[PDB]
Amino acid sequence: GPKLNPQKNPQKIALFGLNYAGKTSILKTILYEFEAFAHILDRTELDFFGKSLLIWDFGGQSVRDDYLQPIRYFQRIKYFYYVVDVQDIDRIKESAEYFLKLIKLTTEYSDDFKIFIFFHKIDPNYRGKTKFEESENRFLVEILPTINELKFTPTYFYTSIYNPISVISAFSQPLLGNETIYQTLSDALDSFCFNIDLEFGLLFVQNFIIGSHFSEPEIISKISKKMTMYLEDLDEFEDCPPFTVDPYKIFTKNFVISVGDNNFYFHFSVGINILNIPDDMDEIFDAMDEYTYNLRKILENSELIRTGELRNEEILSGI
Ligand SMILES: Nc1nc2c(ncn2[C@@H]2O[C@H](COP(=O)(O)OP(=O)(O)O)[C@@H](O)[C@H]2O)c(=O)[nH]1
Ligand SMILES: [Mg+2]
């Protein structure tokens, strides 16, 4: 997948937890499903879908607290993903202790992030439910008084790598809620355009813009209006022809997610400057095709698709 623009400061997803909690396994699930979104050089840092991922272990019996690391690592955190092995009840108190330490550190250096707890290794159809619940409740007993004092509202997920949709849904749903989807898609488009030297990129659903990136902001209104008119003249389920908005040529791919009897029609559009046409247009088309396939897949996790409701004002307020 595409690199992030190194002159830019992406938002971070922190994937934290005790050693053995399952985080590398969770990461690899995402990477096997969405390699097209990942810049792949055990890795502790990688770029994914317009975000920077930080995957760090804590605790255990080795000489365990090596995070107390430069301050830059706790800056720009927007998503705090914390993995808790609920089979390992004896380590739950240790897990909660690091959780609280890391939340306090993150609050010191990052201003506005949200918390997602992955209650992990809840393997499908298998006994163990009493222990799983006891571990989850013990974790919450340890962490909620502090969370409540700090006025967080964490989200709880229930995951297992042996049921990979649970992991894919937990990891992707936070990025694609109505409050975060526009920024997520916009940052993903920025990375996509940077990686192959495109001028701008837009994503639409039902002809409404849900993500946008422009290397020149002066043209946003003009291109957005022209794209709206172009899309409103297109029929369902045909290739979208290229067109020119001088000096740009714009290429569009369409994709669809059905929810019951209803379709959500999406469009992915990117622009090149005709006065500097890339030497390898095939590379751009092949990249767009692969990206579109994976965008369709990850957007199955958006609140839009999960509820079957396009809430324009909520998406615009999320910005
Ligand atoms: N039963 C079960 N084992 C898992 C699960 N996820 C990870 N593991 C196992 O837990 C061990 C630690 O996983 P790992 O991904 O290396 O954890 P990390 O130390 O947090 O990176 C490994 O043996 C994994 O195969 C899961 O969902 N269910
Ligand atoms: Mg690991």
Side-chain angles (χ1 to χ4, degrees), residues 82-257:
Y82 195 79
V83 180
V84 177
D85 174 358
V86 295
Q87 303 194 16
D88 193 356
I89 186 168
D90 293 343
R91 292 192 76 198
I92 284 291
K93 184 179 186 187
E94 180 189 357
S95 181
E97 280 171 5
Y98 277 104
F99 173 87
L100 294 173
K101 285 170 172 166
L102 294 162
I103 284 300
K104 288 168 193 159
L105 272 174
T106 305
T107 297
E108 290 189 32
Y109 297 100
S110 284
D111 203 75
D112 184 46
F113 67 99
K114 288 194 61 231
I115 296 169
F116 303 83
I117 302 300
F118 285 57
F119 289 117
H120 184 63
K121 316 197 186 169
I122 302 174
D123 296 329
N125 287 328
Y126 206 52
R127 68 177 164 266
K129 301 188 172 181
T130 301
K131 185 162 66 177
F132 297 156
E133 291 182 349
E134 287 302 308
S135 289
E136 172 185 6
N137 284 345
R138 179 179 302 180
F139 187 79
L140 295 174
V141 159
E142 293 296 327
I143 71 146
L144 284 177
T146 299
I147 284 315
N148 182 270
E149 185 166 0
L150 296 174
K151 300 191 178 175
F152 283 100
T153 303
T155 302
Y156 313 145
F157 294 124
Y158 299 90
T159 54
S160 164
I161 64 173
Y162 291 99
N163 183 23
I165 189 67
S166 69
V167 170
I168 290 160
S169 308
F171 192 93
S172 310
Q173 284 179 20
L175 310 180
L176 297 169
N178 291 334
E179 289 176 1
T180 54
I181 184 161
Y182 193 100
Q183 174 58 19
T184 293
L185 292 184
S186 290
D187 285 351
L189 292 167
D190 179 326
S191 178
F192 182 85
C193 288
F194 172 77
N195 184 64
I196 48 169
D197 292 315
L198 301 169
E199 300 282 331
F200 51 83
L202 292 139
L203 282 162
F204 306 78
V205 68
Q206 316 298 65
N207 301 336
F208 170 73
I209 294 160
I210 57 171
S212 63
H213 167 68
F214 287 81
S215 65
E216 305 245 24
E218 70 184 11
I219 67 172
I220 298 169
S221 290
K222 167 179 191 187
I223 298 301
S224 293
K225 175 75 76 198
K226 288 294 165 68
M227 286 304 305
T228 297
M229 281 187 298
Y230 163 85
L231 292 180
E232 287 180 351
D233 275 349
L234 297 172
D235 300 308
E236 302 81 320
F237 296 122
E238 57 171 34
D239 299 5
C240 307
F243 70 110
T244 293
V245 182
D246 176 339
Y248 301 104
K249 183 157 174 180
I250 300 175
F251 300 88
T252 299
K253 293 274 303 180
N254 58 352
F255 57 99
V256 176
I257 296 173

Side-chain angles (χ1 to χ4, degrees), residues 19-20 22-25 42-43 55 57:
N19 62 291
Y20 211 76
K23 74 188 70 62
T24 294
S25 302
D42 265 330
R43 36 187 77 96
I55 309 90
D57 299 334

Side-chain angles (χ1 to χ4, degrees), residues 58-59 62-68 98 101:
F58 303 91
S62 84
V63 304
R64 62 177 314 192
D65 306 320
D66 282 3
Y67 67 105
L68 285 179
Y98 277 104
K101 285 170 172 166

Side-chain angles (χ1 to χ4, degrees), residues 7-18:
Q7 292 179 345
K8 301 198 160 185
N9 282 324
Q11 299 182 348
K12 287 190 208 157
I13 301 171
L15 182 63
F16 290 168
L18 299 189

